[PDB]
């Protein structure tokens, strides 16, 4: 298994863990690279699929 | 000389502002959001928020 790091966009990366703590908890959060801090609450918004 | 033989009663409107909107800003929440180390850096600037 030979590994090469070209300048092209990196494609193969290993798996990533996951956990959740949803309501009324001040949490540092990392959603697929979107990092922040705050309280997570269920929403009525209607994001388009993409 | 010229003397008036009649009169008119005129109602005219004058408009004057008296108040603004009372606004407040949480200096820390505006500048640093909920980042602890940004707040620590902000303490280095003294009493600007106050």
Residue of B nearest to A38 (CA): B34
What DSSP string describes B15-48?
------------HHHHHHTT-HHHHHHHHTT-SS
- Output the six-digit token pair for B49: 């928020």
Resolution stated for this PDB structure, in Å: 2.4
Please check whether residue B34 touches A, CB under 8 A: yes
Angle (CA) B34-B39-A31 rounded to 5° is: 30
Please check whether residue A35 touches B, CB under 8 A: no
Which residue, A12, A43, A45, A40, is CA-closest to A28? A40
Residue A3 is given by DSSP the state: -
Which residue, A50, A22, A18, A45, is CA-closest to A31? A18
Query: Considering just the CA atoms, what is the radius of gyration of chain A in Å?
Result: 17
* Contact criterion met (CB below 8 Å) for A39 and A27: yes
């Amino acid at each position: 298994l030979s590994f090469e790091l070209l300048h092209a966009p990196a494609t193969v990366c290993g798996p990533k863990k996951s956990t959740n703590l949803v309501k009324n908890k001040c949490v540092n959060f990392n959603f697929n690279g979107l990092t922040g801090t705050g309280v997570l609450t269920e929403s009525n918004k209607k994001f388009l699929p993409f | 000389i010229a003397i008036p033989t009649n009169f008119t009663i005129s109602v005219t409107t004058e408009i004057l502002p008296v108040s603004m909107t009372k606004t407040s800003v949480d200096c820390t929440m505006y500048i640093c959001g909920d980042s602890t180390e940004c707040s620590n850096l902000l303490l280095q600037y003294g009493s600007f928020c106050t």
